[PDB]
Homo-oligomer: A and B are copies of this chain.
Amino acid sequence: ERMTPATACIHANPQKDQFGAAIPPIYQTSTFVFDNCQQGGNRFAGQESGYIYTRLGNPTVSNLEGKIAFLEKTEACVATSSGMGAIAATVLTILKAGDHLISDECLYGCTHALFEHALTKFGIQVDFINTAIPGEVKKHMKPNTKIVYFETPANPTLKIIDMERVCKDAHSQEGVLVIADNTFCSPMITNPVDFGVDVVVHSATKYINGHTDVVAGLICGKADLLQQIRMVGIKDITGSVISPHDAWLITRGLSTLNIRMKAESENAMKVAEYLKSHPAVEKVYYPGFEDHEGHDIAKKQMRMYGSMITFILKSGFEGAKKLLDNLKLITLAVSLGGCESLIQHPASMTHAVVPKEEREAAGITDGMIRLSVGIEDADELIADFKQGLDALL
């Protein structure tokens, strides 16, 4: 049997340091010395291994990358200095003016604007559609279609998308790449390549680093395509070069990934169920609910049902502000996936950049509240919510 995920977030891609450091050292160096001119020109030509310069590759960054590639069961991984840089380095390597991209319409807010406003201006065409309806991706393909893109569960309604059926329709013509943002599951919950996906991206900012102190992105997929994302999309187009220091912080955060993912998913099931029972609460979205739309597809794709919860209060937006301003243990902030529980209001904060219409066409409402459950004691978490929620009743 393959190393388990639990063992592998600590031991996959073992490094060999010359002094036998238990924890591989930090390669904070912009540049690497050649033994001679012929070796440097050989590396430059892609004909000899070894390092050259940190925008092109770095040993600490490669350690993280081979550990992520193993956990995602992909041939290679390229690390970048933010989830947006991973998204952008991948699609601006693959696309040129005249190509076509299809995307799910419920996306993180900044992915939506990269697709809607920048790819648009570089002559690329995009469709935003609900990729969860059976058949919509095939109805929107054209000869020139190159990428189909989605996030599941989606940020932030937690909509579920049947990846395998999206793939089957996208690969029904040649030359189409399916890209899935797996930030909200992490590689402990889902491996998108299992279902036909070609490329898997992450905001490592969230669960993978898990400690709210690093911004970073990851690209996982085949070696030859990622070699072109490295030499074109990283080298030249985005310049999104992860600091070797932050890469070594994310390997450190990775090694408790499996224990954090289980504990956050167990705490989140308790909290979502508590919330769903409270009288001030109207509606709770959580992929583990049997009444969730796409539950059954979520169960086939997800090993655990995650730590994201989204819910709506019967007091709407003003109720939301009150709950939120009065919480004491839960933290008001954007981002998600850390050890501590965070909460925010997506229409005034993360999805504010997307025009209301476009929000609501996707299902983003003005009363939604988005919660990312940490590893605090579940009863204290429920109790912070009880006190905030009782105050609205």
> A259 within 8 Å of B by Cβ?
yes
Q: Tell whether, in the assembled complex, residue A331 and residue B81 are in contact, meaning their CB atoms are under 8 Å apart.
A: no
> A189 within 8 Å of B by Cβ?
no
Q: Which residue of B lies closest to A322 (CB)?
A: B37
Q: Tell whether, in the assembled complex, residue A123 and residue B97 are in contact, meaning their CB atoms are under 8 Å apart.
A: yes
> A223 within 8 Å of B by Cβ?
no
Instruction: Find A31's partner among B28, B85, B114, B333 (CB 8 Å cutoff).
Output: B333
Quote the shortest CB–CB distance from A283 to chain B (angstroms).
Answer: 19
> In whole angstroms, how far apart are the Cα atoms of A50 and B20 in the complex?
9
Q: A20-B35, A22-B31, A321-B38 are in contact. Are A85 and B335 (CB under 8 A)?
A: no
Quote the shortest CB–CB distance from A132 to chain B (angstroms).
Answer: 24
Residues from chain B with a CB closer than 8 A to the CB of A113 are 235-236
Residues from chain B with a CB closer than 8 A to the CB of A24 are 29
In chain A between 326 and 342, which residues have their CB closer than 8 angstroms to a CB of chain B?
329, 331-335, 338-340, 342
Q: Which residue of B lies closest to A247 (CB)?
A: B243
Q: Mark A200-215, 1 if CB is under 8 A from B, else 0.
A: 0000010001011111
> A252 within 8 Å of B by Cβ?
yes
Instruction: Find A11's partner among B235, B345, B349, B376 (CB 8 Å cutoff).
Output: B376
Residues from chain B with a CB closer than 8 A to the CB of A97 are 97, 121-123
> In whole angstroms, how far apart are the Cα atoms of A59 and B92 in the complex?
30
> In whole angstroms, how far apart are the Cα atoms of A51 and B7 in the complex?
26
Instruction: Find A240's partner among B45, B213, B240 (CB 8 Å cutoff).
Output: B240
Residues from chain B with a CB closer than 8 A to the CB of A87 are 239
Q: A37-B320, A81-B242, A82-B241 are in contact. Are A214 and B31 (CB under 8 A)?
A: no
Q: Mark A207-251, 1 if CB is under 8 A from B, else 0.
A: 001011111010000000000000010011111111101101100
